Amino acid sequence: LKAAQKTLFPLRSIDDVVRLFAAELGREEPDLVLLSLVLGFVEHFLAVNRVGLTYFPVADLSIIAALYARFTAQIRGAVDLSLYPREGGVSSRELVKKVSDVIWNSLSRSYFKDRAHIQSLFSFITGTKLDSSGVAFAVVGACQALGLRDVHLALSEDHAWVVFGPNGEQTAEVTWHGKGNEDRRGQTVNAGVAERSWLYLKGSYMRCDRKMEVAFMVCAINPSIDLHTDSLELLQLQQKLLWLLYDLGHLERYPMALGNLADLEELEPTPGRPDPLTLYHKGIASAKTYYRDEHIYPYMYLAGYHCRNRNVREALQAWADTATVIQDYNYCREDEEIYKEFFEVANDVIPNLLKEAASLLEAGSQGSALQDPECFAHLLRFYDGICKWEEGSPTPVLHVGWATFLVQSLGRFEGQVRQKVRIVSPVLTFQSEKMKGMKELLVATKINSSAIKLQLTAQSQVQMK
Ligand SMILES: FC(F)(F)Cc1cc2c(N3CCN(c4nnc(C(F)(F)F)s4)CC3)ncnc2s1
C-alpha cells in the first residue's frame, strides 16, 4: 500500500467506503486487492456476523493492511517471476496457470461452493474459501499484485476466466464451471466459442479493463443475511458504488451491472436518478452496441421487472425478445442454467401470470393482455425462439413436460383473439420448423391438445391400444 491509499482510513461509514472507491478509480490502476478486502471485511460484519454492530463496522488501516499483507505474502512467496520471463510486457500461459494453481491449491479441501459471502479476497484469506468466479477474480487480483498489467477478467453470463498476452488476445480457464465437469484450467475457451454455446456467448463475452473489474466486485457484493433478510447497509453501499461507477462511465459496457442497478432502484429509488426502466433499456442498448445483441439476461432483467409490475404485455414482449437471442445459439453441455431459466419462464412464470390475467378478465378488466392479439403473438414468438434454439443443438430442449403448459397457455387466449394474428411465411413470422407446423392448430376455438403435443415434441407415434 502506498501512502496515498492509506489516508482515508479508518473507514467509518458507507460514504467513507464510497470515498475510497472514488479515490481508487481516480488512479491509473485501482487496487483490486485493497478494494476486495475492504468489501469483504464490511460484508462479513454486516451480513455474516452482525454481533455487536451499532452502525457500521469500522475498517481500521491496521486491520486492512494486515489482510493485504497476508495476500501479497502468499502470492509473492508462491510465484517466482524469474521462472516466467515476460516478453513484450506480456504474461505467458505458464505464468497464468501457476497463479491459478496457487489460488486453487490454497482452498479448503471440502466446502459447499454455492455458499453466500465466499466471493471476496476477505473470504479467501480468512476462510480459505472462494466461489467459482471468486477464484477467477482472485487470479486477476494476484496478477495485478505481481505487476502483470495484461491479465484481465473475462466474463460471460454464467462463467469467468482471464484474457492476457500479446494484444490481450489469449484466453485461459482459471476456475471450474458448474458441478461435476472436468477441470480445464490452463486451456483456451476456443472450443466453447466454436461450438456456439451460451456459456461462451459466441465470443461476445466481456473483456474487462481494471475499472470493469471493480464493477464486477461491486456487483458481487451480497447483502443477504438470510433467506428473509437483507442488510440495508450493504444494499445502500452496493447501490452507491454502482452509481459511482455509472457516473464515471464504467458500466457502459456492463449490461448485467446496469440490470443489477435497475433492480436496486426498483427496491429503493434514489431521488434524481433514472427510472429502473431507463436503466434496463440502457443494459439492452449496451448489449446491442458492444456485444452484438448476443446476451440473454438484458431482456430477462426487463421482463422480470414487467412481470413484478404485472405488466403482462411488456413482460411477454421482453421474454419473446429473450428467445430471439437464444435462437441463434446451440444448446450445449454446460448451458443448463439458461435452460432452467427458460423452463421456469415457460412452465411456471408465464402460466401464473396468465392465470391471474384470466381471473381479472372474468372480473371485467379492459385492455387485458388476453384480449390483445399482439400478446398472443409474443407468446408464440417466445416458443418459436426456443424451438429454433433446439435446431442443430447437440442436446434437445423440448419434451412432453413442456407441452401441457404450452396447451394451457395458448388456451388462455380465446379463439377470436388468436385468429387475429396473421402468421406469414398483427403479423408474425416463425423461424422454427416446429412452430411452422403448428400454425394450423393455433386458431381453433378448442385447441387440439394431442396434435400440439405431437408437434412440439416431434414424437412419432400415439398409444398402441
Ligand atoms: F462471473 C460469473 F461467472 F459469475 C458470471 C457473471 C454473472 C454476473 C452477474 N449476475 C448474473 C446474472 N444475474 C441475474 N439476475 N437476474 C437476472 C435476470 F434473469 F433477471 F435477467 S440475471 C445476477 C448477476 N452480474 C454481474 N456480473 C456477472 S459476471
Curated annotation (Swiss-Prot):
CDD domains (UniProt xref): Menin
Effect of residue 138 to P: In MEN1; strong decrease in JUND-binding
Interaction with FANCD2: annotated span: 192-364
One Gene Ontology term, aspect cellular component: cleavage furrow
Superkingdom classification of source: Eukaryota
GO molecular function: chromatin binding; double-stranded DNA binding; four-way junction DNA binding; phosphoprotein binding; protein-macromolecule adaptor activity; R-SMAD binding; transcription cis-regulatory region binding; Y-form DNA binding
Outcome of mutating residue 413 to S: In MEN1; sporadic; with Zollinger-Ellison syndrome
Function: Essential component of a MLL/SET1 histone methyltransferase (HMT) complex, a complex that specifically methylates 'Lys-4' of histone H3 (H3K4). Functions as a transcriptional regulator. Binds to the TERT promoter and represses telomerase expression. Plays a role in TGFB1-mediated inhibition of cell-proliferation, possibly regulating SMAD3 transcriptional activity. Represses JUND-mediated transcriptional activation on AP1 sites, as well as that mediated by NFKB subunit RELA. Positively regulates HOXC8 and HOXC6 gene expression.
PANTHER family: MENIN (PTHR12693:SF3)
Name of the protein in its database record: Menin
Organism this protein belongs to: Homo sapiens
Gene from which this protein is expressed: MEN1
